[PDB]
DNA sequence: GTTTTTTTCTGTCTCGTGCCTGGTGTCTTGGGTGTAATCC
DNA sequence: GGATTACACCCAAGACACCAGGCACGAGACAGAAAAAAAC
DNA sequence: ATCAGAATCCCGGTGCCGAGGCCGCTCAATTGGTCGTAGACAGCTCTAGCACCGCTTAAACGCACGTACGCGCTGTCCCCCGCGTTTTAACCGCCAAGG
């Protein structure tokens, strides 16, 4: 059929997700991970939803910035495939060790 | 004019700001011209950024400003972007950054 | 616990007078305004304690606005502030 | 338990696409999980400490706002 | 002649405690004075934010404790909290 | 002096004065400066203890600031604390990427 | 002017950085970024001294301007 | 006779990781700082200690930015620096837009 | 795939009021600068 | 020319007395997201 | 390997200079005494955080499969290292100057 040797799929979904507004990680598993990390320093803590939404917002923004500088590291690497030490170099330069 | 806001011809409450300075543990005493001055600066900043907000919202035939509009208007500015460098907006996202190595040529 | 909503409405009608707004847009705006107010005020308090001046007048506010915002914004803001000082001082 | 593995590969894909990343390697996902985890560790530690002095067993949005302002990753939107 | 400040003699004594056979340069003593300045300033700013996010204007030692374990990283912070708490006990137990 | 009455080494009342003139609150409690002074005391004890070890390394008697920067850059939590901190006459880690060492 | 920066100076900057092998356009690029750095620094420093109403920039104001850019430097009374 | 390249550079790296003395010497640096300072208000006097402060902060700043740029190039499967490497590092830190 | 162009049903927003609380008018007094002179 | 001081002056702090706005709550309307043809 | 020889390390040496002791002041910590409300605390009330489940469905997972950027290799060509040769700001100094 119309199998399409690639190129339009990835960039088209980039166009869609940059036309987009809202989140990408869906709610419940992120919330449960938050509570598992939360169950480590003081037990049995309760939460309002807006805090969790802010956490999700800033989390996705943090990772978006990581991906942007990682992308520019890859472009300077004359590649399009990412690597882990790209992210390690990016966090090395950001001073967030 | 009874109210100092009408005596300044502005839109912000000055005695609000003076009480904020007093209930700030900022200085010990606060003069008369500083709160007016700062409120005027605030009012200019609001009008200035809301200009870019108005044009950025008008870019999409929508009467209402959305947060994406605000982030676009900030990142399309230079002074405001270097202002808001450590700053993130809720429901923001980022700019269209399509690299030239990516389009099907 | 007051927000700055109708202040925003009046600024908006003074600039783009046929423009609506969402709720959370107003929320981000007031977040913005509070951040800016806090940064300037704390920098003015630094001006006092770095300069041993027991109060703060408008001159401190002018130099602090210089210290925060870059050039064009700074000069237009100084202009607007001095014009407000002028019209309030005249009456 | 294991909600660290609740992070899905298509979510990482979606984040890469809005992040603008085209090509995805396979050795990325658990590294991503670890970085995200350490991030949220420092965040929620500080937020819970702010709530420790609050003497209220519930953490608010305002708390997380203040804590992330303390990190300098400061986020608007919810007031604070 | 205006009287200026230093913290040199205090930390000087502390250095003499922890290392009796050790000298020091003057510039480094100024560096340590600036160090105390910086740490004190960050703590005090966190104390003012403690006040305004608690709508209170009294400062007790509890706020200082929560400020220190907000700013400093964990293990170092808990040791310092231990030192301060034992000092609180030794002082306030007597006059 | 309250410092001796706390059995410590930093002057309480100077700090109590500086808390007043800092506009830090409206009122100031009793023993909060004692707690803060002890915090300062243990901090500088730990820092200069590592500095003393740094002088033990080079077999130097007077502390040079290079010792200070090195002892900052060795320990983990201290270096994460003072990440945005630099010092005149500081220098950096004696560090070589071995991928740039010759073969 | 800006050309008072010698080539072996930026080479020594690579050496204390620990950098081995050097290209060409590095030199002028270095002078440019150094220029913009000093531009922002000395601009707000002279802003401090403008508020000081005095005709010499203090070392204190230099230190506080470095704090204002989040570039806190000890050593010289800050 | 002639030595083989790369060696003397690393040997003086081991030498220049030792003395924290200022690399750029005084007079030309002072002239450059004065010339940039000329165009804000005319002919301001200067404290020499402040000049040393500027010198220290500038040199440490540039050394650290070189370190990140060098690690960028090491990631870039190369040994020699490029100006694009400085652009990449600055783009990660966020000086320029 | 993109995007445009109809209803629709529809969520928020602006008008609309009443309650109230901070904002305003002004003296005393005081200290907090204003300014100038004098070191340095 | 900046640091110190000292004499000036002068209006903020407060403290009380008078007050129309400021915001919470509703209503009905009104900009608006999508359903789904429907071209390029 | 392996020797010759640059490059660096490292050991008395002395010198000089500032770190540190030291010492006589005076001004803020102290000591003590007197109002006062901020807050530690008791207690009231209603919201909202939590847990749970049934139903819907769109979203993830596994695999089938080609395939095409990542990469190891190659040749190549060029242009920085470096060592040599002259350069020019720069240090204190001083004898003609006139004058």
End-to-end C-alpha distance for chain D, whole angstroms: 32
* Token code pair at residue C30: 């007031």
Q: How far apart are CA F21 and CA F42, in angstroms?
A: 25
Q: In sequence order, which ranges of chain B are alpha helices (DSSP H)? A: 4-8, 14-22, 33-58, 67-75, 79-83
CA-to-CA separations, A7 to B102, B104, H31, in angstroms, rounded: 8, 7, 55
Domain boundaries, chain D: 1-80
Count of CB atoms situated within 10 Å of the CB of G50: 19
Closest CA to G44 of G74, G73, G66: G66
Which residues on neighbouring strands pair with residue B65, listed in sequence order? C21
d(CA C33, CA D20): 31
> Resolution reached, in Å?
7.6
Q: Does E27 touch chain G (CB under 8 A)?
A: yes
Coil/strand/helix, residue G69 = coil
Task: Give strand pairing partners of D58.
Answer: A46
Q: What one-character DSSP code corresponds to residue F10?
A: S
Which residues on F lie below 8 Å from A95 (Cβ)? Answer: 83-84
Residue B100 burial class via C-beta count within 10 angstroms: exposed 0-12, middle 13-18, buried 19 and up: exposed
Dist CA C12 CA B104 (whole Å): 43
Q: What token pair was written down for D28? A: 């990325």
DSSP string of chain H, one letter each residue: --PPTTHHHHHHHHHHTT----SS-HHHHHHHHHHHHTTTSS--EE-HHHHHHHHHHHHHHHHHHHHHHHHHHHHTT-SB--HHHHHHHHHHHTS--
DSSP state of D3: G
Ramachandran angles phi, psi of A40, nearest 5°: -115, -25
- Whether domain A2-97 has CATH 1.10.20.10: yes
Count the residues in chain D.
80
Backbone angles phi, psi at A44, to 5 degrees: 65, 60
Residue A46 pairs in a beta bridge with: D58
Is H64 part of the contact surface with chain F (CB cutoff 8 Å)? yes
* Cα G47 from Cα G57, distance rounded (Å): 9
Inter-chain contacts counted by CB atoms under 8 A, chains D and E: 18
Cβ-based neighbours of D57, under 8 Å, separated by 6 or more: A44, A45, A46, D51
What is the C-alpha end-to-end distance of chain F, expressed in Å? 65
Q: How far is the CA of D10 from the C1' of I6 (A)?
A: 36
Q: Is the CB of D25 under 7 A from strand K?
A: no
d(C-alpha A82, C-alpha D19), whole Å: 13
Structure tokens at E7: 């913290």
* Residue pair B105/A13 in contact by the 8 Å Cβ criterion: no
- Where is F32: in which H helix or E strand? helix F32-58
User: What 3-state DSSP class applies to B18?
Assistant: helix
List CB contacts of E5: < 8 A, sequence separation 6 or more. Answer: none
CB F27 within 8 A of CB B25: no
**Torsional sign, CA F56, F59, F63, F67:** negative
Instruction: Please state which CATH class domain H1-97 belongs to.
Output: mainly alpha
Chain CA centroid to CA C69, Å? 11
Q: What angle do CA E35, F3, E57 make, to 5 degrees?
A: 70
3-state secondary structure string across chain E: CCCCCCCHHHHHHHHHHHCCCCEECHHHHHHHHHHHHHHHHHHHHHHHHHHHCCCCCCCCHHHHHHHHHHHCCHHHHHHHHHHHHHHHHHHHHCC
The token duo for F87 is 């010092």
The CA distance from B90 to A60, in Å, is 11
Q: How far apart are CA C31 and CA E28, in angstroms?
A: 42
> Rounded to whole angstroms, how far apart are CA atoms F68 and F54?
8
Tally of CB atoms within 10 A around F77: 14
DSSP state of B66: -
Q: Taking CA atoms, what residue in D is nearest to C38?
A: D80
Name all chains with 3 or more CB-CB pairs below 8 Å to chain D: A, B, C, E
Nucleotide nearest to B33 (CA to C1'): J12
Task: Classify domain G1-78 at the CATH superfamily level.
Answer: Histone, subunit A (1.10.20.10)
SS3 per residue for chain A: CCCCCCCHHHHHHHHHHHHCCCCCCCHHHHHHHHHHHHCCCCCCCEECHHHHHHHHHHHHHHHHHHHHHHHHHHHHCCCCECCHHHHHHHHHHCCCC
Instruction: Look at residues B47, A61, F66, A34 and name the one whose alpha carbon lies nearest to residue G75.
Output: F66
Domains of chain E: 1-95 (1.10.20.10)
- Neighbouring chains of F at 3+ CB pairs within 8 Å? A, B, C, E, G, H
Residues of H in contact with F102 (CB under 8 A): 6-7, 10
Residue of B30, G71, D44 lying closest to H64 (CA atoms): G71
**In this complex, do E46 and D66 lie within 8 Å of one another by their Cβ atoms?**
no
**CA distance linking residue D62 with residue G2, whole number of Å:** 49
Domain boundary assignment for chain H: 1-97
Taking Cα atoms as reference points, which of C24, A51, A93, G69 lies closest to residue B85?
Answer: G69
**CB within 8 A of F20, min separation 6: which ones?**
F28
Strand D58-59 to strand E23-24: parallel, antiparallel, or no bridges (unpaired)?
A: unpaired
Closest Cα to residue C25, out of F26, G56, H91, B54? B54
Contacts for H72-79: CB closer than 8 Å, 24+ residues apart: H72/A73, H72/A76, H72/A89, H72/A93, H74/F97, H74/F99, H74/F100, H75/A73, H75/A77, H75/A85, H75/A86, H75/A89, H76/A76, H76/A77, H77/A77, H79/F100, H79/G20, H79/G21
Q: Supply C76's token pair.
A: 């237009």
Q: Is there a contact between A54 and D25 if contact means CB atoms under 8 Å apart?
A: no
The domain D1-80 is classified under which CATH number: 1.10.3720.10, 3.40.50.300, 1.10.20.10, 3.30.300.30? Answer: 1.10.20.10
Residue G77 in contact with residue G60, Cβ under 8 Å?
Answer: yes
Domains of chain F: 1-103 (1.10.20.10)
Q: Which of C32, C31, C90, C84 is nearest to C62 (CA)?
A: C84
Answer yes or no: is D1 CB < 7 A from strand K.
Answer: no
Look at the block and give the residue holding tokens 């293990």: E75
With CA atoms as reference, report the closest residue to G68 among G56, G53, G51, B21. G51
């Amino acid at each position: 059929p119309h199998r399409y040797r690639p190129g339009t799929v990835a960039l088209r979904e980039i166009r869609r997700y940059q036309k987009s507004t809202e989140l990408l990680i869906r709610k419940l598993p992120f919330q449960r991970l938050v509570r598992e990390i939360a169950q480590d320093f003081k037990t049995d803590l309760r939460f309002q939803s807006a805090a969790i939404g802010a956490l999700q917002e800033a989390s996705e923004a943090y990772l978006v910035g990581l991906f942007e500088d990682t992308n520019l590291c890859a472009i300077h690497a004359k590649r399009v495939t990412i690597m882990p030490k790209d992210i390690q170099l990016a966090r090395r330069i950001r001073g967030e060790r | 004019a009874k109210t100092r806001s009408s005596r300044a011809g502005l839109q912000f409450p000055v005695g609000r700001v003076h009480r904020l300075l007093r209930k700030g543990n900022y200085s010990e005493r606060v003069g008369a011209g500083a709160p007016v001055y700062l409120a005027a600066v605030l009012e200019y900043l609001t009008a200035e950024i809301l200009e870019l907000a108005g044009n950025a919202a008008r870019d999409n035939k929508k009467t209402r400003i959305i947060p994406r509009h605000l982030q676009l208007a900030i990142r399309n500015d230079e002074e405001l972007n270097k202002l808001l460098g450590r700053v993130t907006i809720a429901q923001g996202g980022v700019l269209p950054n399509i690299q030239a190595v990516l389009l099907p040529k | 616990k007051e927000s700055y909503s109708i202040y925003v409405y009046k600024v908006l009608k003074q600039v783009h007078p046929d423009t609506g707004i969402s709720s959370k847009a107003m929320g981000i705006m007031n977040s913005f305004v509070n951040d800016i107010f806090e940064r300037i005020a704390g920098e003015a308090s630094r001006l006092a304690h770095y300069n041993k001046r027991s109060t703060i007048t408008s001159r401190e506010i002018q130099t602090a606005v210089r210290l925060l915002l870059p050039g064009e914004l700074a000069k237009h803001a100084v202009s607007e502030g001095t014009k407000a000082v002028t019209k309030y001082t005249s009456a | 338990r294991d909600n660290i593995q609740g992070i899905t590969k298509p979510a990482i894909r979606r984040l890469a696409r809005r992040g603008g990343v085209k090509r995805i390697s396979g050795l990325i996902y658990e590294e991503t999980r670890g970085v995200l985890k350490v991030f949220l560790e420092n965040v929620i530690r500080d937020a819970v400490t702010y709530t420790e002095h609050a003497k209220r067993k519930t953490v608010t949005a305002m708390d997380v706002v203040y804590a992330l302002k303390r990190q300098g990753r400061t986020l608007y939107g919810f007031g604070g």
